[PDB]
Predict the structure.
Amino acid sequence: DSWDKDVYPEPPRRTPAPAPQTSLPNPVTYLTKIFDLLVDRPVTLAREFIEQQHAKNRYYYYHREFRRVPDITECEEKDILCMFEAEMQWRRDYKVDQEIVNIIQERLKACQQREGESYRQNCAKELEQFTQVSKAFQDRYSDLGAHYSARKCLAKQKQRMLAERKAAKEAAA
Amino acid sequence: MLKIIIPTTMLLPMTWMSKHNMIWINATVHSLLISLISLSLLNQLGENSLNFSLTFFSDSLSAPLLVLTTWLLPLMLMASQSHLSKETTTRKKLYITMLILLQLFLIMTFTATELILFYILFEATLVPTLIIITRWGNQTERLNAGLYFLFYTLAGSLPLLVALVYIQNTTGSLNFLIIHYWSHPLSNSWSNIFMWLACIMAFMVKMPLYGLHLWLPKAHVEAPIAGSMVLAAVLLKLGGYGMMRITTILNPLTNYMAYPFLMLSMWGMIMTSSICLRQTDLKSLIAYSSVSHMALVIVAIMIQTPWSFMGATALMIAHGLTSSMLFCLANTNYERVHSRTMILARGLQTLLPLMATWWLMASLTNLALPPSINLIGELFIITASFSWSNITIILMGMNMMITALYSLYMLITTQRGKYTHHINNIKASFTRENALMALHILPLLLLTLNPKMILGPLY
Amino acid sequence: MNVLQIVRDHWVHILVPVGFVFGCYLDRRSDEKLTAFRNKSLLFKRELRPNEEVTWK
Amino acid sequence: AYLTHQQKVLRLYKRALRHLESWCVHRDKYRYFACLMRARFDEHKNEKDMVKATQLLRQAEEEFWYGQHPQPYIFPESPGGTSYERYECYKVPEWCLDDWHPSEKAMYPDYFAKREQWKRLRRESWEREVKQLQEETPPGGPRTEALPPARKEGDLPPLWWHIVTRPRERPM
Amino acid sequence: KRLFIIKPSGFYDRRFLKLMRFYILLTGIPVAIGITLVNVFIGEAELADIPEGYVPEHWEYFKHPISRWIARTFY
Amino acid sequence: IRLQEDPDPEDENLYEKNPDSHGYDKDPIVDLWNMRVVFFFGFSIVLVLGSTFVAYLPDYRMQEWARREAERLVKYREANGLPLMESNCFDPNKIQLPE
Amino acid sequence: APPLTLEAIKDRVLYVLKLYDKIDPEKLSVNSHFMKDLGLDSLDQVEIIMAMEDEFGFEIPDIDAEKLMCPQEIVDYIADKKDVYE
Amino acid sequence: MNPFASLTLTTLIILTIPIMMSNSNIYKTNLYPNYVKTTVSYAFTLSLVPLLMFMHTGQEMIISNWHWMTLQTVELSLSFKMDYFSVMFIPVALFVTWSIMEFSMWYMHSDPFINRFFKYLVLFLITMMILVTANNLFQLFIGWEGVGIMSFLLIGWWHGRTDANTAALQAILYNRIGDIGFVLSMAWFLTHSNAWDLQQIFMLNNECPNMPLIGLLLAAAGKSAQFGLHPWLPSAMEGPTPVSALLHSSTMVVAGVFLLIRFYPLMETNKLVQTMTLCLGAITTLFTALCAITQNDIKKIVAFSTSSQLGLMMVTIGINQPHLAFLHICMHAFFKAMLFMCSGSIIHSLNDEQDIRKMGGLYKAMPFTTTALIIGSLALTGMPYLTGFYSKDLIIEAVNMSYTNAWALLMTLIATSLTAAYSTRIIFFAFLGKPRFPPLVLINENNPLLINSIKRLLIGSIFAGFIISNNIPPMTVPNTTMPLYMKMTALIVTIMGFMLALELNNTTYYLKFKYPSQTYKFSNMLGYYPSIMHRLPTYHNLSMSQKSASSLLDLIWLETILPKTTSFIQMKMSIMVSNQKGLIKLYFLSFLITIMISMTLFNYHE
Amino acid sequence: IRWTYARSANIYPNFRPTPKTSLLGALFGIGPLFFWYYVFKTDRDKKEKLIQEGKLDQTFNISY
Ligand SMILES: CCCCCCCCCCCCCCCCCC(=O)O[C@@H](COC(=O)CCCCCCCCCCCCCCC)COP(=O)(O)OC[C@H](O)CO
């Protein structure tokens, strides 16, 4: 197709062998056969003519990379230039992590429909995967406000190990 | 900008020196053309706001408003050109001068980069509007209405001016960028409390908020149609644009202080829509309808969550195009019957068949069916408000239930009924009216396909 | 075809698009004033093209 | 105006009979109970005292009001009826035709020409109706809601335009 | 026994409806043809790796050719 | 009399003079040009051509790029056996917590 | 269905009155005023219009009903109400 | 990925073609209704195909397509979900809407806007189709509001009828109260589960959705016209007969019950809310049926009979029987739609007479229409091996063999017996008796369109109960071993209901004088519901709007506190500071004080 | 026309401040506003105190 199974795991199909014991013909074979010979075949014929027409004049496009830049943890206070470079990179990291959750949601939705009735247990691995994504995404970006910024993200982050330091020190006793 | 501001300014000498009768033609030509040019700014980059010069910049919030204002400019021209065709050439030229000037301030305000520059032009919009409502108004209460509109806006704006210059002396520059990247924690203190109140009240009055809203039923109803749109379709959102920008610094004091405003808007929006349930003037019906929608924007801003800001801009743009439409609708009847009472002209679908259809989609857009942009805005706020508090869905939905009754109420009272016997001057709708109405609703339904353009700066 | 009349009533039409040209011109008259850090952001810092004078105008 | 007693009792008979229609249903039951209703009305017909007549009415109106069918049968072409103003939404006033485009005006030359004759006839007779009114106004303004007819020849009845040219009850 | 049908004049409304069908489609079909013609003759681009020396100047980082053309000029 | 003013003259039936009247002004010829300009410079080029421009704009607020940046990050992270996205936002090793 | 026409109404009009046993068949002039010659009680005409009310499927309001007193009148009012114009 | 994906999706695209074709006016204005009907017929026959692979392969589809917006971490986009409930509902809905569209030609053969009316019907069908075929909750809301507004126009189709707008206003009013819970579930399913697609919601396993399901239930009550929100269905009879026969019989009011069917897997986890569903269905069944029997208009009787049916369906949903409800959906869809244009045929023939009193003598006067009525009435009862049996008494047997809410079980048994009760009233007064209509009889059902429309649906009531039950895969828990006595109570209560209702109806034949029972009064004016409901809170809310709200608070108080008081304050001393008497002595004396107070008294020196 | 005047303009000039109007202004006005303030503030205090301790869990709630 146009992707890889490692990003969208679709377990290999399991199709049965249709062997109708009853002598009366199966109609569903007939409407499928006429559909191929009346609709599907002209569609394929037009598509291949379209594909070769595209192949004659091939113009290419590439993908834009953004080289890693210093983030806001090493950004000097009131350094407006490093403020901008850090803020833009963090928001770009925000967009990709939003898409990371987007991918996991698609896999989970595929987990439901593909299993149908057996959605509960067949791909609970999808459920725990989304559990790890959503929980970590909660402490990573959630509750940052409509004016979220890399300074705010550190502020929320700093609250975690500060609370964690108190807990573990209490735990060590 | 310079690429939109300069053509806008250059329309001013063009209309003044235009031909005697070609004023309406040429002004409509290029105002549509300038709107086409402003479609270029609908694109926004990844996260950094589109910056052109030091004084002018755009983001994924200003540009959706910029196109709305410049697209509006042709609409006021055709709507007003009905009655304005019966006065002196200079008087008509003076009007087109004033709409062009009024639009000019709106374009420059929305792309202002310095908060002081924002405030100067934000308040400067009063002068073109104030003269519109007063000089060319068609009633007697306009004289009191103009004073109410001017004084309410100014009484709130003046504390902002004192507050704004205070930020300049203390923090430094007030550029919308340097403010964002140098946000400092506004700690809870009585001086900060009034700092918060001053920077907020100015934009609240122009929303308007429940209680600081009595200027709207006077200003909007008495204003001429070329004005009756802008006081409801763009410059109410101008107060909205002020809120979403000024709240960059007002954290975290906003959540502690937002409670009086939330309760006033969240409870008052039920009362305001209750006024619409029993009204006598069609213009007042839509006017109070605007208050309910803007009140929903008022609460939306203050949670300061990604979903709320999106639904804020979505409703903000959609309501403006909607509320502008209904004012065109009330204008058509008000010209034919020369009165604003609802029950006077009951029965229009019998006589005007397509006018009912335009009224149907107009009242439907206010009804906010899915996937209309009104619904895509209100629904987003409901989810954001519900996450803030579960109880608010009782109030949020109650308006959604209440807004159905009145939004279809003028549909029943005016269109769906026996035609009034005594009235005999109803004429087949001019192709200007129908063309204008299509210019309102066609972009709205077309916008439904791609809400990303108008979804705000957080998509 | 009585060109005087055309330039009497339609000389006003050209007045706007030249303003738009002026608007574009001033935008490209101003942007180079904001040059400062041109190809200086380390994200977009890249070795200049060989037979090309400079990066983004 | 003042509804006299003999009219009001007739209104009771008409309405009460229509109410037992919703009760009796079957025709033979109707004709029986109607005759008892009819004669029970006629048995008390020599009351020289008009006060006693209202005293007889003092229990009849409450008798109707509690014996009334909660879903009385009313013909659809009437208030409460299922077909009340059902075809009203096509009653386009005739004066709207004056706004038709000439292409549509020329589509029906005969009817439009006759419409002109009626319009010319209405124009001529309007002032004739006008002076007819003040020629026979009652001293002190119009006393009754009624409307006097055309007394002389060649005069249309006063205030005839809307009544005569009203849309048909079945316009479609 | 057929008779007249007094109805509101819809000719001007018919004019308005017909005109959009003539005006909104005057540039409607040519762009609709242009959108389809572009997608089938010049076609849609395909993903390719970054060349050794060629940086993708501005408009290159886009799939659709007409979308690339808008990126070429304008922005 | 009190005041000497002409009363409300009338509401001029714009359809009466030209039966095909357009509702823009009195003079027919310029009024005929008035739809020819509002329709042409309206629906045609700012509604149809306007829609195609905005609807087919170069991708706004890059998402399919961000959608692109997802697969190689997750593919790299899941293949070598590392949690696909860390709980901490910014690197915590260089954080110097107070005391 | 063809519209209810004037000749159709009147033929249906004296259809009901002659079907009334209180009226002799012979004395049935189309303009025979109910009180004058037939001499039926003032309650009776109120009960005959109900049969006419059911006959044509309509309503005769009491305001007009009490004045309606001729077979010509009954066909007149019904014809005028249901736009009968031959 | 068979043709089952593409071919089932194009069914909607075939349906929406007439809507686009209408504005171009290429259609011949004479034969537009024929254009609509054969278009739906083509879609119907095209919609048969999704069935054949459903029984054969047992496969279901989820068709997602063009992305709407990548809003944060949710992917709101157009998407369709073919499944057991979907792939068969469209063939039933298309078959029903095809039959009525054929019938609508004969009935509405005089409405001047007939092209507009058929345009509205197709638009409703499109909105209903996307309602039954929706993957995200937002898309479900598109239909959930599309059918509601489409009902509003179609109910007020006759336009000028003053009370029709009230019912049209009533229909949207009760719907909006239903949508209260819909938007509540929307917000909850987006906040606590970060989605609106049904796939994610089920995977996330929100095992305790107390408030969502409560909001989910409230959505059904407004749309399915349950108790507390029923009366808009009886008032919807003010619309034309085909209008209610399509929308308010088997294709629009079904939305409410259908919503729970979509969220059935999440239904079983909760126990409190599901009891409320069977509780709400129980009261809805009786009260609608209790008001059904004592009504004297044919349209009202069928309306209350419908609302009694949907009350029964939610009773099934209560005790973990969602799919059996969908079986009840299809079986109820066939015959109930039939009964409406059987009533429509007699109503039009009897010069628009709908009052059940001015009827009678139609069994031999209208043979086919009477024949269809008996078939439809018997389906309401559930005669064995007929369409009614394959759903209804299976539920009654199912509800008996369950841990029900005692008092909830009894009401349905009283209700199902009550179903026969008003059924006799329809057959008794309208057909079995002596004629009572106006003298000029215009009875005629010989029109081919009327015969063909009823004939097509009538064979669907003799059959298709056995056909569907056998064809659908066996996937419900079978109640095999019950004690005999309650196994056939459904036949007992109907026969018992048949016997006494006939005797009481025939009691009217007895010349005995009638006494108005106060219990009969309570039933006849719809449980006193409309006059308290539709008069008291409407007055109170509107009263609060005028004396308060608009007046008092606004226009008096809010204008006299901030704006006018400041004007008065600025004014009271304005009269003062501008009334200097002009005497030089007073001016210079004020100078003395101003000099004196400033120099030393204010300590301005230091 | 008189009715529109009576409902729109001839109200405040004919308004007379009395304890009945004054009390109704407070009861129908500031009253419910504080009522909703108390209800919402208590819920926010309830919610805020609960997730601080760790009572409510939003392991899957991310968008807000
Ligand atoms: C028409 C009535 C008002 C309508 C509503 C307006 C908005 C409500 C708030 C009103 C006050 C607005 C003025 C705010 C000025 C700038 C606020 C600001 O930035 O905060 C300062 C705080 O502002 C103030 O102190 C002044 C504002 C508080 C209110 C007192 C003056 C305004 C009220 C009276 C005049 C207006 C009322 C109308 C009178 C006719 C911080 O400075 P500081 O106090 O910390 O100074 C440093 C140090 O601590 C000591 O100075």
Observations:
- Chain G touches chain H through six residues (CB under 8 Å).
- Residues B 155, 159, 162-163, 166, 191, 194-195, 197-198, 201 surround PGT (CB under 6 Å).
- Residues 6 and 76 of chain G are 8 Å apart (CA to CA).
- The longest helix of chain G spans residues 6-19.
